[PDB]
Structure 1
Amino acid sequence: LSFHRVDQKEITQLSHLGQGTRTNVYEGRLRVELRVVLKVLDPSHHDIALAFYETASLMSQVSHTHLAFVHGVCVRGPENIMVTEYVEHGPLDVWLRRERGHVPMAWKMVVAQQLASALSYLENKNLVHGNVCGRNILLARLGLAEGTSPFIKLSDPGVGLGALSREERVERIPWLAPECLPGLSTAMDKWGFGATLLEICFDGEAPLQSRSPSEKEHFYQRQHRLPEPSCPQLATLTSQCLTYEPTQRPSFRTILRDLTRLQPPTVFHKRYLKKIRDLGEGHFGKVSLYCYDPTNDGTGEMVAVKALHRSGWKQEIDILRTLYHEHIIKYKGCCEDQGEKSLQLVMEYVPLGSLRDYLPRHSIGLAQLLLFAQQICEGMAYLHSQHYIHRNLAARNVLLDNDVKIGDFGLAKAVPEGHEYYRVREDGDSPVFWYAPECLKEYKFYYASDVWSFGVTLYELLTHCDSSQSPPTKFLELIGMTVLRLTELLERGERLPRPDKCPCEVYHLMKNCWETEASFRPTFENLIPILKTVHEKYQ
């Protein structure tokens, strides 16, 4: 379970906006200054306080243009509070009820498309929202003015569901999937979506409004079909969505297929960038989370921006521009400081962040730890094929969205085709405890040096980045100074110990990787099959 930690001092609570199940929503401010909303959870049952925190987790590990941003969770005495993105026009059903008779079906189709896109995203990630209703859809941009179009953000689902009472599940009918009545199918969000489309078509009026909880239950028991909307093939889409048998409900790829058919660059300006938080310090500078809102309408995208010799900084940007791979951090563009002042690197925001901070948070097993390892090799083997040495492979520089992403290209160099190794004396810091004996002793960097660097990250994966059991601390226990004592240590054959509960088979690879002679080390291409075979072992 993962979300960012928010302090009680950072938040301020404002006007009460309304109530959700077991919650009281407030406008607020985040001192990281920032307009937010505070969903406050009433002092409640553990089973439900956890299902609230489970939601914050689902939402802190996702990144989509049509999903409302979760800043983190804060504890203000007896109450659990979640800091969410404040959206200008608020709950969609409320808005539709007030805009009754001034909303075209063209406008509703854009919304339907956007919502389906946010759920198509969740579907690919095998994640379930569970509370898709117009109240949990927020209106950022109106889209009523000529030349414009609506923009929505699907908000957090609040307390889980099923964690909730049965007579509360009955109150959520017809948004509630019928299978969910006896107290998790990804098929439940295709029922909620279809029920939401009816809510949207009927301009905020809930279908089955004038029915008692007992009357609602009867409708589901007797399986009466839900009302047909306005028109056209939307009634077809709605109907398939609203099938009591979950297996018959169409996929969000098919929903978004039907919807897209029903229809009629690298320059970032500092002005449109609005900081959220800092993300970490790397080689060359700080990475900070930004929001890039060019239209100022609160519909921008979340980017990671890195700042701050100048020549070697440019090199970081030039290398990253030319790398396209599933496990390497993605280049987006550039930002110019001031009149010649400096250049800024715009990247993709990686929801779960560095492994170094993620690992001592839920002691994840061999299946997960090894999956990461094989991927770092999948990403490193591609880097090496592009004729570059990394020189900075550590767990601090390995990011993860789900469950995966290799960053910090500050030390990466290009090896000219002919040359065996690359000489670098430095004039900066270097992760010595992740460097091979030839790197420390003679300043020589072979492709083989990154493989040494790998085995060291592989160690951290298995120590769960334990600060007491870490490459700098453990290699220093062996002494009682610099790289010189380290050089002789490794030259004797002395290695980092085996982490507790590290399968001996895994610790063999680390040893293979920590070969003194660089030419005796396995290649990154050679390690992928080896890691696949082993990853198809610890289940």
Structure 2
Amino acid sequence: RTLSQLSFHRVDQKEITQLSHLGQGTRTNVYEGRLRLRVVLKVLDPSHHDIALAFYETASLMSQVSHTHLAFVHGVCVRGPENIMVTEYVEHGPLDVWLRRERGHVPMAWKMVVAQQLASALSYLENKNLVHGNVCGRNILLARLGLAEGTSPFIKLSDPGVGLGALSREERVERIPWLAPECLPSTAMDKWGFGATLLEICFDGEAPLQSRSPSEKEHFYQRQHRLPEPSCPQLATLTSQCLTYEPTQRPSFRTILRDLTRL
């Protein structure tokens, strides 16, 4: 343990202060903190080496990319038996939580801005041949709200947490319909994730299949059922192209981004 062949900044525990609990991610508890910067501390549960390795791989890869719409990763701290990823605090938190609270008065124009910013971030990851693997409204963080007159939203995509490759079948099923179908048993999976996230954003933060059970979610992919049409009709062609069960038929993010700018 503590791989020694990945590149990430090692944060000393004397440099971080842990403040309030914010929520949970997959096998993590996340806390507001300070880095002597306003940060978020993502404390991994006591885990087997394989899970910790997938956590450190995310930290290393997200430490070496840069983009206007990607949240910073500052490093990893080992505080006793706890691996803690130190990441950027994004002022207004997860998009899906805010959208549900503000449901009914978030205009379509606002959602198209967000879609375009997200597509831009994924276009960059595609060009670098890097998989995110956890594109969803929860992992879209709002840096600027953009509802007030003369303003516009600004989002940052959070890190994917513990790498998808290390997660259990039951955790993968919990991620339906954001999870690409081929992942239930490549950067193409993030096209599906993006498409599902557009449905979520259009539905003001309510994802399709939310009221279903794990077994029913798994059934949905098993029988290759069709996901719903978005409530922004101008996105219906785009979402249908991304939410295709065959991965090679999904369009590239260069095409997605171009199409969004014309919509």
Q: TM-score range by the shorter chain?
A: over 0.9
Compute the displacement of 1:210 (Å): 1.2
The 1-side partners of 2:89 and 2:187 are apart by 27
Compute the displacement of 1:216 (Å): 0.7
TM-score, normalised to structure 2's length?
Answer: 0.96
The 2-side partners of 1:111 and 1:2 are apart by 31
The 2-side partners of 1:224 and 1:157 are apart by 26
SS in 2 for 1:80: strand
Unaligned runs of 5+ in 1: 261-538
* Alignment correspondent of 1:38: 41
Alignment of 1:48-63 (within 5 A): 48-63=51-66
Compute the displacement of 1:65 (Å): 0.5
SS in 1 for 2:24: strand
Compute the displacement of 1:233 (Å): 3.2
Choose which of 6, 23, 27 in structure 2 pairs with 1:22. 27
Compute the displacement of 1:49 (Å): 0.3
SS in 2 for 1:52: helix
Compute the displacement of 1:161 (Å): 1.1
- Asked if the contact 2:108–2:232 (Cα under 8 Å) also holds between the matched residues in 1, the reply is no
* Alignment correspondent of 2:12: 7
Which protein, 1 or 2, shows the higher relative CO under an 8 Å CA cutoff with sep ≥ 6? Answer: 2
Q: Write out per-residue CA displacement over residues 498-532 of structure 1, whole angstroms, 9 at most, x where no aligned residue.
A: xxxxxxxxxxxxxxxxxxxxxxxxxxxxxxxxxxx
The 2-side partners of 1:231 and 1:87 are apart by 27
Unaligned runs of 5+ in 2: 1-5
Compute the displacement of 1:102 (Å): 1.3
Compute the displacement of 1:206 (Å): 1.2
Compute the displacement of 1:188 (Å): 0.3
The 2-side partners of 1:175 and 1:44 are apart by 25
TM-score, normalised to structure 1's length?
Answer: 0.47
- Asked if the contact 2:55–2:162 (Cα under 8 Å) also holds between the matched residues in 1, the reply is yes
The 1-side partners of 2:145 and 2:187 are apart by 30
- Asked if the contact 1:162–1:169 (Cα under 8 Å) also holds between the matched residues in 2, the reply is no
Q: Write out per-residue CA displacement over residues 88-123 of structure 1, whole angstroms, 9 at most, x where no aligned residue.
A: 100000010101111001000000000000000000
- Asked if the contact 1:171–1:213 (Cα under 8 Å) also holds between the matched residues in 2, the reply is yes
SS in 1 for 2:254: helix
- Asked if the contact 2:140–2:158 (Cα under 8 Å) also holds between the matched residues in 1, the reply is yes
The 2-side partners of 1:30 and 1:243 are apart by 43
Q: Write out per-residue CA displacement over residues 476-518 of structure 1, whole angstroms, 9 at most, x where no aligned residue.
A: xxxxxxxxxxxxxxxxxxxxxxxxxxxxxxxxxxxxxxxxxxx
Compute the displacement of 1:209 (Å): 0.7
The 2-side partners of 1:153 and 1:21 are apart by 19
Compute the displacement of 1:232 (Å): 2.5
Compute the displacement of 1:239 (Å): 0.5
- Asked if the contact 1:30–1:36 (Cα under 8 Å) also holds between the matched residues in 2, the reply is yes
SS in 2 for 1:228: coil
The 2-side partners of 1:78 and 1:150 are apart by 39
The 1-side partners of 2:46 and 2:34 are apart by 22
Percent of aligned positions that are identical: 100
Q: Write out per-residue CA displacement over residues 169-194 of structure 1, whole angstroms, 9 at most, x where no aligned residue.
A: 11110000000001xx1100000000
Q: Write out per-residue CA displacement over residues 233-289 of structure 1, whole angstroms, 9 at most, x where no aligned residue.
A: 3011001000000000000000001001xxxxxxxxxxxxxxxxxxxxxxxxxxxxx
Compute the displacement of 1:218 (Å): 1.0
The 2-side partners of 1:177 and 1:47 are apart by 22
SS in 2 for 1:176: coil
Compute the displacement of 1:5 (Å): 1.3
- Asked if the contact 2:54–2:165 (Cα under 8 Å) also holds between the matched residues in 1, the reply is no
Q: Write out per-residue CA displacement over residues 128-179 of structure 1, whole angstroms, 9 at most, x where no aligned residue.
A: 0000001111000000111110000000100001311101111110000000
- Asked if the contact 1:36–1:83 (Cα under 8 Å) also holds between the matched residues in 2, the reply is yes
The 1-side partners of 2:234 and 2:182 are apart by 26
Give the 4+ runs in structure 1 shifted more than 3 A.
Answer: none
SS in 2 for 1:83: strand
Compute the displacement of 1:58 (Å): 1.3
The 1-side partners of 2:188 and 2:32 are apart by 33
Compute the displacement of 1:2 (Å): 1.3
SS in 2 for 1:38: strand
